């Protein structure tokens, strides 16, 4: 019931197009159901009057039927168009609405939901739902109307023959459903066995180095051969049941038709029916058969659409656990760029058992370079995720110029913070579009502005050296870039953003010699006159930093100047 | 032509089952094609003699038809079984033969071929090929025979009406193929546009952290909305062409049938034909129509099967670039376990541009522990891949007791070498089956032997602590184990193998305190009385090693004792 109201509201903006096409469907289906009745009358006319010339009647009827078909073709053409376009408009609304809900969700949601599932819900499930209220609804409506008129016309033509069909088909159908359920079981048994054998195959192929190492290729080959030779034994049993079922289905189908031809034939000779009347009944019986299969198919697709519906309403009505674009903004005067971690406790949502910060307190003063030092896996990169408010701490507070970052507008907060990652991420756009991404309006930035920041970032040389220049499509689906090239485009993107706070994640595994000089020069121009928090692995950056913070087991164990920290009581 | 001989040879072991079922198919199809001809004669009998009682004739004919259907059902049941089983036996041979060819290939082949493609070729393409010589062949044979008899019976019943159908259908069909080709183009245009929009969606969802960082969620939402709103415009144009095509197809189909009813109707009145004769012709015309669609479908599946055939014969006939189980074996007397790298040059096949070893010479003496020292990414793990002969060097030689490992049987060579990896690999088997994997005959090892090696490896405690004990299914698809637990089962597997040469890859990122003691004790028992080559990151192992080798830029830069290396001219 609550799912039905959601499906009705989905079709509601297209109600006039769908009703017009339903009108065309109703007409086409009803006028078409007249053909067995009128063909029954024409059959009896020829039979009664074999001596009469019907040339003018045939020509007048065929010219009449030609115009009816031309109208029928135009009606069907208009109907298909209205149904396809209505579905397209429904799917379009579902695509834009779903993608909007997804991007508004917190990072933690993406941590527990695979991109593949979100894309499957965006591609497959939106297509299902769209046609389920349109094309599927028309299919089930046509089949439902044709079964109704068909059964009614069977009882109209002959109540005796119709009651007979009604007493024979249901018992046969119930027995066929029991045989069909047994056949489904034997198929699962064969396909479970086959799945096991393919998992074995996939595991051994994927880990062929370990298989070689232990000289087990011949062993695995024979292990797999035994599994698939067993699948063959299960498939033989499934084939025997399927053969016996197709034989039983075929026999029953033929003997039911034969019973109607026989009973009908007897009723003809008894003067209860005519040859044409029997032809009507058989034609209507064939139509009901097709209409039953049509309703059956409609039901399968209705279920698939309802299943897809639940998966979409689940994301569309999902409220993010972190504010999207809501909170305060600070004026030019009260914003200085000072940050403060105060007794911060945090564990990732995917691994809540593993604590990252255990009473983490750090003061990053305005315009000062703070160097974050610690062992690999200590949780240095987690500091950047918390400052951008990708996640909220479990306990403690993160403050910007005395304000808890939870009170600020997150979109605004992130506009004041720039980041240059260990492994920069570039989308499959032009180099210019990737650089423009820094700006609050990437459409407003001029070609001259993209060139300026590219020169400062020591990127302008390799970019112009590319055949397409700034229009070179990069990312995964485009032209591949070196680590240092990606980093300089990231520095260009940061430069254009022009943040007061800058967060730097240095590479522990240092890049090439020629890159490492051009990148260090660009990083220094980017660090100038900004609040910098650097996760450093180079002794040159720690020495030049205003203060050094040592992260050991989720807490700041040591805090002071590089010289003061090195000149510890034990040295 | 060469593909046709391969398809014939594939069906050859099943030739007697397939020929028997073809015999049953031929009978069923031919006896069935008699029904429109005999129904035409019965129609004319009723018409000519309306005053005659046909009760006994009807009852005798229906009882006769009942027995013919019972034979027809039994023939169809036997045919389906023989076709399903024949295909199953063909697919089974294809599965075992393909998996055997895959596991026999060199590691470099797996480096350039994705497991997904190999599994798709093992699952999908084997199923296609199997039914293409069976079920598809029966389908195309039936359709081909029924179109032949159908067209022959159309010309037999009426050469005038058949010539008429033959002059009308081909021109209409050619125009429909041109419209169908145009419709395919408009569909690709819409689906190329939709693909672009989904790639954008997937990229942005997958990289939502970067999108948040630059506050571009609202920007991307509107970028995607614009792309899918454009897809809607292309889909509207595709729907207009599809509507006009379904209308044209429907009209033509109806007007062709109407032409035959009209021309036939006129020929009836002229005394050139009877009502029954026309019914025969129309029934045969409907059968040819279905048979044309049948041949068309058979052709699509023949092409799919030929495509899959080429992909399978490609791997089945592939000769590995490295010997599988061919070469010499050394006697107890001449095998001591001494290894020697001599001027080894090697670059991985996937990255040939990047050299790993540049004149690499190393002597690992019998019963001596050699510690391999070098920077991360220097190519220390590549030494283990070359010793197991997973790859062959480009230049230089690897020798075992003076013998080039290329002359030895690789399966035998690997039986004398054991490895304990940084990240051990366990299959989705029981713990016992994973341990038994060490033995040359994992079926021959007793429960007592698996328990012995488990005690030495300090693994017996946690294994027995598991609810299923040694029968606990581990790996990816089973119960998850800690790094130290996996390593101790790897040490148990190595212990059972009992190799003379042992290759150890220590973890640079050291595991937990409780594990690191139980693992170091088990590693020491495993190192005892063996030729050991350890890639060390712990100062305790380098100090206790007989000699240390420093790997710097694919060459052994320094070679000597830990004390001698530390007491270098500059220290
Ligand atoms: C694996 C696959 C399967 C493998 C194989 C499986 C096994 C195979 C076999 C299976 C079993 C087959 C069994 C076949 C049995 C039937 C054979 C048979 O009858 O043969 C001839 C048949 C001969 O009988 P007949 O006299 O020719 O015909 C009798 C009919 O009554 C003729 O009736 P009539 O001529 O008197 O006319 C009907 C009459 C009377 O009306 C009706 O009969 C119409 C009835 C329609 C009922 C519809 C009900 C729908 C629901 C309503 C309520 C809604 C829901 C309410 C609330 C529900 C609860 C919440 O019409 C009206 O009065 C009009 C009423 C309109 C309203 O039986 C035999 O001769 C014996 C042969 C035995 C062999
Ligand atoms: C998007 C979808 C599409 C949208 C719409 C597209 C547009 C729609 C329209 C398309 C175009 C439609 C055009 C329709 C034109 C036809 C209309 C027509 O004829 O109407 C009545 C038709 C009336 O003619 P009729 O006298 O009733 O029938 C004449 C027939 O000749 C009757 O012949 P007959 O009664 O004298 O009997 C035939 C005779 C003569 O034999 C034959 O005709 C049999 C011929 C069979 C030929 C099979 C050849 C197969 C290949 C052999 C060689 C193998 C390969 C060798 C090597 C190849 C190279 C490597 O049989 C034999 O001699 C037996 C020979 C057995 C051997 O035309 C008109 O009255 C004009 C109406 C105009 C409207
Ligand atoms: C696939 C599963 C198997 C299918 C089931 C097969 C069951 C057998 C079907 C037999 C059909 C013949 O059924 C037979 O029809 C005639 C004609 O209506 C009936 O005959 C009776 O009614 C008719 C009127 O309807 C009278 O003219 C006639 O005098 C009277 O005897 C028989 O009482 C009935 O037995
Ligand atoms: C397996 C094959 C099955 C084939 C179908 C069954 C055939 C059975 C043969 C017996 C039927 C012949 O039975 C006979 O049919 C004609 C035509 O309908 C009936 O005739 C009735 O309709 C015709 C019009 O069609 C009128 O001209 C006639 O005045 C009227 O009585 C006869 O009254 C009836 O006795
Ligand atoms: C979907 C695309 C459109 C479909 C194409 C439609 C084309 C029009 C079809 C018209 C059919 C009638 O075709 C007409 O048949 C009769 C009967 O055979 C022919 O009539 C001729 O031959 C018959 C014998 O065959 C003689 O009895 C008759 O005296 C003679 O005139 C006409 O010469 C022919 O014109
Ligand atoms: C859109 C609807 C189309 C419906 C199909 C076309 C109907 C056309 C109506 C005109 C046909 C009537 O034409 C008439 O048919 C009968 C029956 O075949 C023929 O009769 C012929 O066969 C019957 C047997 O069936 C014999 O009893 C008879 O001796 C013989 O001449 C007539 O010689 C012919 O003139
Ligand atoms: N999305 C996520 N879900 C769960 N755990 C995550 C995670 N992202 C990171 N982690 C884990 O959090 C821990 C600390 O993360 P982080 O990446 O911050 O540290 P680090 O930057 O100190 C590693 P390195 O020094 O090698 O770059 C790691 O053990 C990491 O695997
Ligand atoms: N199958 C493969 N194809 C291509 N390159 C590969 C490869 N396996 C390894 N490499 C590359 O070869 C180089 C050296 O490999 P290897 O794994 O031997 O070194 P290492 O063991 O010194 C790394 P670490 O010290 O971090 O464990 C690396 O740059 C690695 O990425
Ligand atoms: Mg990091
Ligand atoms: Mg390694």
Ordered DSSP codes for A360-407: EEEEE-TT-EEEEE--TTSSSTHHHHHHTTSS--SEEEEEETTEETTT
B269 and A198 in contact by Cβ < 8 A?
no
A99 and B324 in contact by Cβ < 8 A?
no
Cα B309 off chain centre by: 13
Q: Can you give the three-state secondary structure of B273-301, one letter per residue?
A: CCHHHHHHHHHHHHHHHHHHHHHHHHHHH
Residue A379 known to bind ligand: yes
CATH number of A333-571: 3.40.50.300
DSSP state of A408: B
B 212-231: CB under 8 A from A: 212-221, 224-225, 228-229, 231
Q: How far apart are CA B521 and CA B516, in angstroms?
A: 9
* Token couple for A82: 């209205």
Q: How far apart are CA B80 and CA B74, in angstroms?
A: 10
Q: How far apart are CA B12 and CA B140, in angstroms?
A: 19
Chain A residues within 8 A of B73 when measuring between CB atoms: 247-248, 250-251, 254
Q: Closest approach of chain B CAs to the CA of A421, in angstroms?
A: 10
Name the 3-class secondary structure at B413. Answer: helix
Q: Which one, of B570, B99, B296, B437, lies nearest residue A231 by Cα?
A: B99
| Residue A375 Cα to ligand 9 middle (Å) | 11
A254 lines ligand 1 (CB under 6 A): no
Q: How far apart are CA A330 and CA A409, in angstroms?
A: 10
Q: How far apart are CA B213 and CA A424, in angstroms?
A: 12
Q: Which one, of B420, B442, B415, lies nearest residue B490 by Cα?
A: B420
> Which of B35, B38, B77 best probes binding to A when mutated, by most A CB atoms within 10 angstroms?
B77
Q: How far apart are CA A183 and CA A239, in angstroms?
A: 9
Q: How far apart are CA A145 and CA B227, in angstroms?
A: 39
Cα A139 off chain centre by: 26
Q: How far apart are CA B53 and CA A269, in angstroms?
A: 7
Buried b / exposed e along B179-200 (16+ C-beta atoms within 10 A):
eeeeeeebeeebeebbeebbeb
* Token couple for A395: 């306990």
B221 and A275 in contact by Cβ < 8 A?
no
Q: How far apart are CA A526 and CA A510, in angstroms?
A: 19
Q: How far apart are CA A221 and CA A283, in angstroms?
A: 57
| Residue-wise DSSP of B451-508 | HHHHHHTT-HHHHHHSTTGGG-B-SSSS----HHHHHHHHHHHHHHH--SEEEEE--S
Q: How far apart are CA B546 and CA A331, in angstroms?
A: 69
End-to-end, the C-alpha distance of chain A in Å comes to 75
* Token couple for B77: 């049941």
Q: How far apart are CA B479 and CA A260, in angstroms?
A: 62
Contacts for B368 with CB less than 8 Å, ≥ 6 apart: B531, B532, B546, B547
Q: Which one, of A449, A492, A447, A486, lies nearest residue A470 by Cα?
A: A447
A455 lines ligand 7 (CB under 6 A): no
Q: Which one, of A386, A375, A378, A387, lies nearest residue A355 by Cα?
A: A378
Cα-Cα-Cα-Cα torsion B418, B424, B430, B434, nearest 10 degrees, comes to -10
Q: How far apart are CA A392 and CA A398, in angstroms?
A: 9
A176 lines ligand 3 (CB under 6 A): no
A179 lines ligand 1 (CB under 6 A): yes
B228 and A100 in contact by Cβ < 8 A?
no
Buried b / exposed e along A58-73 (16+ C-beta atoms within 10 A):
beebbeebbeebeebb
Cα A3 off chain centre by: 20
Q: How far apart are CA A344 and CA A254, in angstroms?
A: 78
Q: How far apart are CA A551 and CA A346, in angstroms?
A: 14
CB atoms within 10 A of CB B81: 21
Contacts for B276 with CB less than 8 Å, ≥ 6 apart: B39, B40, B41, B42, B43, B44, B47
> Which of A239, A245, A422, A480 best probes binding to B when mutated, by most B CB atoms within 10 angstroms?
A239
- Resolution for this experimental structure (Å): 2.9
Q: In which element (H, E) is residue A25 found? A: helix A15-32
* Token couple for B233: 């415009």
B243 and A80 in contact by Cβ < 8 A?
yes
Q: In which element (H, E) is residue A317 found? A: none
Q: How far apart are CA A520 and CA A537, in angstroms?
A: 13
Chain A residues within 8 A of B104 when measuring between CB atoms: 217
B376 lines ligand 8 (CB under 6 A): yes
Q: Which one, of B293, B257, B280, B298, lies nearest residue B150 by Cα?
A: B280
Q: Which residue has the tokens 């090697």?
A: B346
The answer to whether the CB of B212 falls within 8 A of the CB of A107 is yes
Buried b / exposed e along A396-408 (16+ C-beta atoms within 10 A):
bebbbbebebbeb
Chain B residues within 8 A of A414 when measuring between CB atoms: 212-215
Q: How far apart are CA A116 and CA B202, in angstroms?
A: 8
| Residue A208 Cα to ligand 10 middle (Å) | 18
Cα-Cα-Cα-Cα torsion B379, B384, B389, B391, nearest 10 degrees, comes to -20
Residue of B263, B269, B277 best suited for mutating to test ligand 5, as the one with most atoms within 8 Å of CB = B263
Q: Which residues pair with A549 in a beta bridge?
A: A372, A559
C-alpha separations of B323 from A205, B96, B100, B102, B107 in Å: 18, 20, 14, 13, 11
Listed in order, strand segments (DSSP E) in A113-171 are none
Domain ranges of chain A: 1-332, 333-571
Q: How far apart are CA A40 and CA B257, in angstroms?
A: 18
Name the 3-class secondary structure at A438. Answer: coil
C-alpha separations of A46 from A11, A269, A327, B161, B265 in Å: 49, 18, 85, 21, 11
Closest residue of chain A to B47, computed from CA coordinates: A47
The answer to whether the CB of B531 falls within 8 A of the CB of B502 is yes
Burial class (CB in 10 A: 0-12, 13-18, 19+), A56: exposed
Domain B1-332: which CATH number of 3.30.365.10, 1.20.1560.10, 2.60.40.1230, 2.40.50.140? 1.20.1560.10
CA-nearest residue, atom 7 of ligand 7: A348
Q: How far apart are CA B503 and CA B417, in angstroms?
A: 7
Q: How far apart are CA B320 and CA B394, in angstroms?
A: 17
Angle at B476 between CA B472 and CA B478, to 5 degrees: 30
The answer to whether the CB of B309 falls within 8 A of the CB of B182 is no
A203 and B262 in contact by Cβ < 8 A?
no
Q: Which residue has the tokens 């020169």?
A: A455
Q: Which one, of A320, A326, A503, A499, lies nearest residue A408 by Cα?
A: A326
Q: How far apart are CA A519 and CA B102, in angstroms?
A: 46
Angle at A292 between CA A290 and CA A298, to 5 degrees: 100
Q: Which residue has the tokens 């807490």?
A: A555
Cα A523 off chain centre by: 39
Return the half-sphere exposure (C-beta side, CA atoms, 13 A cut-off) of residue B267: 21
Tell whether A190 is within 8 A of chain B (Cβ): no
CB pairs under 8 A between A and B: 285
Chain B residues within 8 A of A88 when measuring between CB atoms: 232, 235-236, 239
Q: Can you give the three-state secondary structure of B216-257, one letter per residue?
A: CHHHHHHHHHHHHHHHHHHHHHHHHHHHHHHHHHHHHHHHHH
Name the 3-class secondary structure at A68. Answer: helix
| Residue B169 Cα to ligand 5 middle (Å) | 16
Edge-to-edge strand ranges of the sheet holding B501-505: B417-420, B501-505, B531-535, B369-373, B547-551, B556-560
The answer to whether the CB of B391 falls within 8 A of the CB of B397 is no
Listed in order, strand segments (DSSP E) in B374-465 are 395-400, 403-404, 417-420
The answer to whether the CB of A259 falls within 8 A of the CB of B62 is no
Q: Which one, of B488, B336, B531, B503, lies nearest residue B418 by Cα?
A: B503
Q: How far apart are CA A509 and CA B520, in angstroms?
A: 28
Tell whether B66 is within 8 A of chain A (Cβ): yes
Q: How far apart are CA B43 and CA B38, in angstroms?
A: 9
DSSP state of B409: -
Name the 3-class secondary structure at B351. Answer: coil
C-alpha separations of B455 from B431, B432, B452, B460, B489 in Å: 14, 13, 5, 5, 10
> Which of A54, A68, A81 best probes binding to B when mutated, by most B CB atoms within 10 angstroms?
A81
H-type alpha helices, B33-158: 35-48, 55-104, 107-112, 115-132, 135-157
Chain A residues within 8 A of B255 when measuring between CB atoms: 66, 69
CA-nearest residue, atom 29 of ligand 6: B48
- β-bridge pairing A395-400 and A369-373: unpaired
A248 lines ligand 1 (CB under 6 A): yes
Chain B residues within 8 A of A110 when measuring between CB atoms: 205, 208
A 318-377: CB under 8 A from B: 324-325, 376-377
B351 lines ligand 8 (CB under 6 A): yes
Q: How far apart are CA B462 and CA B515, in angstroms?
A: 11
Name the 3-class secondary structure at A286. Answer: helix
Q: How far apart are CA B196 and CA A442, in angstroms?
A: 21
* Token couple for B150: 């159908």
| Residue B47 Cα to ligand 4 middle (Å) | 8
B 15-44: CB under 8 A from A: none
Q: Which residues pair with A342 in a beta bridge?
A: A397
In terms of phi and psi (left: phi > 0; alpha: psi -120 to 50; beta: otherwise), the region of B556 is beta
Contacts for A540 with CB less than 8 Å, ≥ 6 apart: none
Sign for the CA dihedral angle at A433, A439, A440, A442 comes to: negative
Contacts for A377 with CB less than 8 Å, ≥ 6 apart: B509
Return the half-sphere exposure (C-beta side, CA atoms, 13 A cut-off) of residue A498: 8
| Residue-wise DSSP of A505-563 | E--SS---HHHHHHHHHHHHHHHTTSEEEEE--SHHHHHHSSEEEEE-SSSEEEEE-HH
């Amino acid at each position: 019931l609550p799912e039905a109201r959601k499906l009705l509201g989905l079709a509601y903006p297209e109600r006039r197009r769908l009703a017009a096409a339903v009108g065309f469907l109703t007409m086409s289906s009803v006028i078409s159901m007249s053909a067995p009745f009128f063909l029954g009358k024409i059959i009896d006319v020829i039979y009664t009057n074999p001596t009469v010339d019907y040339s003018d009647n045939l020509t007048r009827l065929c010219l009449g039927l030609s115009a009816v078909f031309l109208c029928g073709a135009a009606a069907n053409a208009i109907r298909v168009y209205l149904m396809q376009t209505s579905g397209q408009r429904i799917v379009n609304r579902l695509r834009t609405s779903l993608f909007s809900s997804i991007l508004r969700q917190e990072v933690a949601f993406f941590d527990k939901t695979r991109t593949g599932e979100l894309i499957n819900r965006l591609s497959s499930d939106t297509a299902l739902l769209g046609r389920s209220v349109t094309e599927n609804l028309s299919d089930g409506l046509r089949a439902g109307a044709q079964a109704s008129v068909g059964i009614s016309m069977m009882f109209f033509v002959s109540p005796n023959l119709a009651t007979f069909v009604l007493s024979v088909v249901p018992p046969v159908s119930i027995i066929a459903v029991i045989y069909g359920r047994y056949l489904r079981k034997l198929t699962k048994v064969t396909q479970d066995s086959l799945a096991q054998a393919t998992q074995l195959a996939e595991e051994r192929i994927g880990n062929v180095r370990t298989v070689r190492a232990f000289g087990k290729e011949m062993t695995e080959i024979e292990k797999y051969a035994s599994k698939v030779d067993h699948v063959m034994q299960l498939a033989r049993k499934e084939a025997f049941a399927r053969a016996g079922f197709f034989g039983a289905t075929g026999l029953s189908g033929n003997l039911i038709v034969l019973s109607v031809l026989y009973k009908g034939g007897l009723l003809m000779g008894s003067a209860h029916m005519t040859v044409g009347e029997l032809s009507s009944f058989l034609m209507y019986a064939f139509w009901v058969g097709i209409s039953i299969g049509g309703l059956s198919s409609f039901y399968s697709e209705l279920m698939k659409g309802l299943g897809a519906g639940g998966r979409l309403w689940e994301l569309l009505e999902r409220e993010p656990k972190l504010p999207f674009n809501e909170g305060v903004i600070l004026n030019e005067k009260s914003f200085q760029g000072a940050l403060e971690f105060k007794n911060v406790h945090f564990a990732y949502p995917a691994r809540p058992e593993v604590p990252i910060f255990q009473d983490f307190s750090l003061s990053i003063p305005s315009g000062s370079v703070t160097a974050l030092v610690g062992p690999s896996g200590s949780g240095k990169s987690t500091v950047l995720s918390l400052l951008l408010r990708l996640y909220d701490p479990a306990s403690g507070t993160i403050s910007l110029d005395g304000h808890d970052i939870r009170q600020l507008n997150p979109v605004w907060l992130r506009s004041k913070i720039g980041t240059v990652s260990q492994e920069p991420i570039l989308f499959s756009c032009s180099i210019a579009e990737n650089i423009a991404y820094g700006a609050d309006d990437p459409s407003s930035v001029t070609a001259e502005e993209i060139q300026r920041v590219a020169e400062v970032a020591n990127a302008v040389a390799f970019i112009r050296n590319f055949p397409q220049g700034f229009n070179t499509v990069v990312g995964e689906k485009g032209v591949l870039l070196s680590g240092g090239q990606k980093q300089r485009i990231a520095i260009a993107r940061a430069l254009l953003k022009n943040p007061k706070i800058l967060l730097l994640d240095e590479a522990t595994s240092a890049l090439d010699a020629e890159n490492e000089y051009l990148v260090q020069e660009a990083l220094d121009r980017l660090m100038d006159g900004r609040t910098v928090l650097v996760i450093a692995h180079r002794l040159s950056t720690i020495k030049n930093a205003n203060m050094v913070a040592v992260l050991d087991q989720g807490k700041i164990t040591e805090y002071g100047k590089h010289e003061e920290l090195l000149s510890k009581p034990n040295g």
